[PDB]
Amino acid sequence: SEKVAEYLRRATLDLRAARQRIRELESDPIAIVSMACRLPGGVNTPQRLWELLREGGETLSGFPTDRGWDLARLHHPDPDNPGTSYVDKGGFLDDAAGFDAEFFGVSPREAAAMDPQQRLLLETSWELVENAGIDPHSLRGTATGVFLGVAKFGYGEDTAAAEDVEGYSVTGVAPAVASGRISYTMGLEGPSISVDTACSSSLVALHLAVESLRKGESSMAVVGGAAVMATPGVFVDFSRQRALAADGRSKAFGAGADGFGFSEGVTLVLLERLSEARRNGHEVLAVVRGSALNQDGASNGLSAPSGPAQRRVIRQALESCGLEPGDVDAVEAHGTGTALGDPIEANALLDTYGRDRDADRPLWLGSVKSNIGHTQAAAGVTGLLKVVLALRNGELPATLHVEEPTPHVDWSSGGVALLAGNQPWRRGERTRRAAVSAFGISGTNAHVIVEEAPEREHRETTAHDGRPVPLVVSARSTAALRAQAAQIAELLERPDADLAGVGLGLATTRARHEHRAAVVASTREEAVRGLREIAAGAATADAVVEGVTEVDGRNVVFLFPGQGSQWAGMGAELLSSSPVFAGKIRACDESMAPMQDWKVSDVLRQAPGAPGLDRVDVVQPVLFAVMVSLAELWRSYGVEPAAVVGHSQGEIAAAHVAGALTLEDAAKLVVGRSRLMRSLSGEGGMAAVGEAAVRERLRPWQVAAVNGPRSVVVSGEPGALRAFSEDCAAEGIRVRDIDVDYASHSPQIERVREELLETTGDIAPRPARVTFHSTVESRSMDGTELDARYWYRNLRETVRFADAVTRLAESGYDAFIEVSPHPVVVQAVEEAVEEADGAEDAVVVGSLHRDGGDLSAFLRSMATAHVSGVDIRWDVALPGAAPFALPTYPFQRKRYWLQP
């Protein structure tokens, strides 16, 4: 039969899928996307650590003074007095007692009772998440796991604070809480494990995280370790064993090798699967391939190491990933600097790598403890950082104290060579790989294989034009906001960063805290000046907006006024600077073409031989088209209205925004209304000033709109209001409009009352997807109730505006957006909202001004709306941009140390 071939094909496909699944479950590569560190000597960034390693130097220094230690009797040259240490140098963090309690929502008492390791871990985790280009708030609710190497050191063991009803003294020192707090604050939902295996805890955590990622329990892993000493006991203990170097330098594979020098430090890395990293577009720095663990077993004492165990670890690690000894260029050794540990490690490395090795490509050997010292549990992953840096800049840092190699190790084989000086490691045809080793006091051993990341080609579509660019900065405090603004200004001042990249990075990679500020600029100098003005303290320029908000979402209400917002050049260049606006205008012109001859685009562009902005029949369609185009432009940025309110004929536009009507039907209705409006051009007169005040002076002559408590517009009649203009004489009738022969909402309206129905009696309204609270009736209807009779009633009945605004404010809406080429009812809306109970945090924002109308003005209005709570998708304003690299959050630190 011929069916066999399809069976063969399906079997081959299934076999391939099964093999791929086996490979994914067994040896799926893992990608490193970001890292963070805090190391002695003022090293707080990976770049600073790389600079220190390349220059060649140590962080050795004297004992700390602010920790409250008693340095007087602590030091004694004789290694026999109890409670004294003969060494007095080591690597210590510059500021280990600083913390920003308010940023993480921690009361000062809890922060004071909290171990410094937890505080530093929180800060470094936030910095690591920010460095990857990921919004920290986006990780909330995900499945990110945490794996840390942390051990207790005895912080706050001399304090007996009784008033601890909350119980801060217990959870503030517990090693499990060191990761529980990170998970709780960041909102992660992955496994949280705090391992502790001597000084190799970090690599064990890395192995566990790799296993968890390969299984699929977690999608991201925060791996690392921390070690901060709060008491001088550690040194004292080792001072009894004479295991500390007198000078304090840890000479790895050197002639002296009299001991090791301890140091503090916190280190973290972020791990994710390579395929998912490529899918999501995260940056990739290096690839972890394989790892292995074992036990020393029966050895020459509990603490002494064993060579065969190390050889077995190396062989297992090489075999697990499918590699072979000979594809590894360099090994980052343990190198504690002891008298006999270094010979053992070097002999194991020679046995496992040196044999059958090319005589032209020796294995480079070095360690990082010769520069920064042995950083307790965080040592292992720390070495990893070095390798990653060596894979980015392209050279191997040298190892100090090497000029006299240890005579115990026989270097005559040539398989392994020490890093006397820097060696170039540029990318080539040979894939670059490296190994990291860690061995602990307990006996657990770890070996990890890392490889260079794959290649990205261009990712270059800058096209830095003169388009406006918004810069949005945010922070949880005024001082923090000022520091952030200063940092961004300093970053922009350098002549190597584009505005589009900085804007996109600020918009899509940083969080959105309470205090917010925004600057819309087209040139680098303008942005720098605006940021400097923000950082100064006082904001004066209109291009700078600042605000404070306590929420993240608002109910947006679109409101459309009637007439009075006319200005020649509405938008203008805006038509050519925004595809959506031009497209909507063209659609409106196409819809209106089968009835007229002139085009709205010609009028907006001041084309010659076109009607001016003086006749109603041409003013109204222009206003309607501008209004609908502005609504579409607003919606294109991610702002979706929850209710629409129209004033007078503007209601029609609102209907089209509501979706109840269609573009053709709405255009035809507006055209018919304007045409009938033109005929009744003999009587009119709008006047502006309490309903009762108007009623008591309206009887002799035989009310159009109500905007507030003292804002009433009356009907139109030349003779009737000719006397009214002077009858008040008490600031009654002062504000007047042009309104040449309108007489809207007047008994003159029902004079015709039939041709409008005949012309507009062809609409086909449909149900709407958004509330359409009208003004003629204080109610919310649907499309099915919007007929020509309703429009006639709207033309006739009163269009009271204050009641609708008050009802919306009391209902729960708290964000009113004004959509018009010029704000005319913003003041009335603000007054009505303030007078009504509603909420005391409502924000009213306008649109293009009568003197602006440029895309810059629209972006400024959007920033004004955003700094108050409204969510806006800024990336739309920056198409085809490449995100940049920005400094992390500028924490404001205070001293929290438990003083004895």
């Binding site: 066999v4 069976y7 399906r10 079997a11 299934d14 029966a298 050895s299 020459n300 004492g301 002494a304 190491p305 064993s306 060579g307 065969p308 008298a339 006999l340 010979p343 053992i344 002999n347 115990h408």
Partner: protein, 100 residues
């Protein structure tokens, strides 16, 4: 070594005796009975210095160079003796039903 051509047990016993004699002087006592071929050197009182000296005492015993960390790799007399000895010396449907 010059003394060769012996069964396995003879060489093993001779090397064990040599190791015990060498380590006895380092320990201090002049008898091999107190030295056990299973107890780790740490339990016998060996430190870092003396452990080196034993190697030297072995270096002159057999005239062959030994690693400076010989004791740590082989944490008993028997293992050291063994290391010294080693160095000195139709279908279509059902079969296709797996696919579904």
């Amino acid at each position: 070594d010059r003394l060769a051509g012996l069964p396995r047990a003879e060489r093993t016993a001779e090397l064990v005796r040599l190791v015990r004699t060498s380590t006895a002087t380092v320990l201090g006592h002049d008898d091999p009975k107190a030295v056990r071929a299973t107890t780790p050197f740490k339990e016998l009182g060996f430190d870092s210095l003396a452990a080196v000296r034993l190697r030297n005492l072995l270096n002159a015993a057999t005239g062959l160079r030994l690693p400076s960390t010989l004791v740590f790799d082989h944490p008993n007399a028997s293992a050291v003796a063994g290391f010294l000895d080693a160095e000195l010396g139709e279908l279509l449907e059902a079969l296709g039903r797996e696919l579904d």
